[PDB]
Design a protein around this ligand. Structure first.
Ligand code: RXD
Lengths: 233, 235
């Protein structure tokens, strides 16, 4: 068929790793307002009938162990899997409270051959974290083991990722608003495309210092899905 | 307006870079079956009403030059822009005949601030090249806008992975891309076309080799989208 089977007895897990406070030896700063994103996500995915588990202030080892355990659960009665990461980042990596974790390490747990009860089911990774330090100035006007993954990144490779301490990050605030409005009408890729547009046109940084002023952001959809994804029917 | 305006006088250019033969100093093999891909692409994109320009066996300098020249053209009367790269590669790199070129360097020529007549229009890069040497063993079941916006990078494989070519039929990804564009360009949104491309490659293809190391290998393409709207080839 053209569309993933989403009529399993359960939608699936939605794990949200929310890191705000970081260890002293890291020099990493606290991500103020991240709880806004975490709460917004929790409610959005609960409304999508996901079983949501929230984690807070996990270490790199704790992140690894959480994903290992979760990958070893029996997902046979679940349609999909969602993991949302809220943290500092670097290209290809997310930060535990006490140090880096390669993203590949945690998603390898769910590879078609390592988590058999999710083989052929959509595995979604939503990543609110930096991918580098670059700023966007803007401009005027048998199946493969690596299949059935989707990575919804807040930014393009190499780029910084913008957040508002009060309103939420640009990406998650837009993701939730778009899932809320369209998760009953549009296929996921088209939801995510609405997300890009909303982040691209509605947001623009403000700074008293020109270096950080009027900067822009586009999110980055990375799809290895083999079917269309509708959260209904 | 949830979709790109595709009813400009022209659909736009479709530049195809087809690298078959590489200088002896590299020690890169010839890419057998690539002319099949290049011919398939040419016919497919002409049918889509794109202005195809085929270029064969370009050097790293020539690639850069071509991309520079085309980026400096006036794309005002064009709906979009397509560029297909067929060659050897590594993560983030395609090979000219004489050596490596960073993909970022070629796609940067078209960034919303360096190519004004393409601002707000979809820039499509179709990349048939290795992104490393990993092999997928498979598993059994059988206002202002950002300058990095409006780009789509359609990769033949996942990051870190080998990309499979067949001497007779061409590459698994290009073969499959042409078939689905032929079948659905008139009906489906582009992301939906590429998703079908993904399923086709993932299910219908498996490598054959007398070397068990290279036998029974699988492949999934990788769609990287910073598009802001739905793309339909027919108005
Ligand atoms: O640090 C970040 C994200 C931003 C951050 O937490 N601090 C930060 C540090 C320097 C700069 C910036 C942020 C900028 O936003 C910036 O515009 N320029 C910077 O020098 N990413 C990063 C940091 C160091 C290295 C890196 O990539 C190396 C791996 F190839 C990526």
């Amino acid at each position: 068929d053209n569309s993933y089977k989403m009529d399993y007895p359960e939608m699936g897990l939605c794990i949200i790793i929310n890191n705000k406070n970081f260890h002293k030896s890291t020099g990493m700063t606290s991500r103020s307002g991240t709880d806004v994103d975490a709460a917004n996500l929790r409610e959005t995915f609960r409304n999508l009938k996901y079983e949501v588990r929230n984690k807070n202030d996990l270490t790199r080892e704790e992140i690894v162990e959480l994903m290992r355990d979760v990958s070893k659960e029996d997902h046979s009665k679940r349609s999909s899997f969602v993991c949302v990461l809220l943290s500092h980042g670097e290209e290809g990596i997310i930060f535990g409270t006490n140090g880096p974790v390669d993203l590949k390490k945690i998603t390898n747990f769910f590879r078609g051959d390592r988590c058999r009860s999710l083989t052929g089911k959509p595995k979604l990774f939503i990543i609110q974290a930096c991918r580098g330090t670059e700023l966007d100035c803007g401009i005027e006007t048998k199946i493969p083991v690596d299949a059935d993954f989707l990575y919804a990144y807040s930014t393009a490779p190499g780029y910084y990722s913008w957040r508002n301490s009060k309103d939420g990050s640009w990406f998650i605030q837009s993701l939730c608003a778009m899932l809320k409005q369209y998760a009953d009408k549009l296929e996921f890729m088209h939801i995510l495309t609405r997300v890009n547009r909303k982040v691209a046109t509605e947001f623009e940084s403000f700074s008293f210092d020109a270096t950080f002023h009027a900067k822009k952001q586009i999110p980055c959809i990375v799809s290895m899905l083999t079917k269309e994804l509708y959260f209904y029917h």
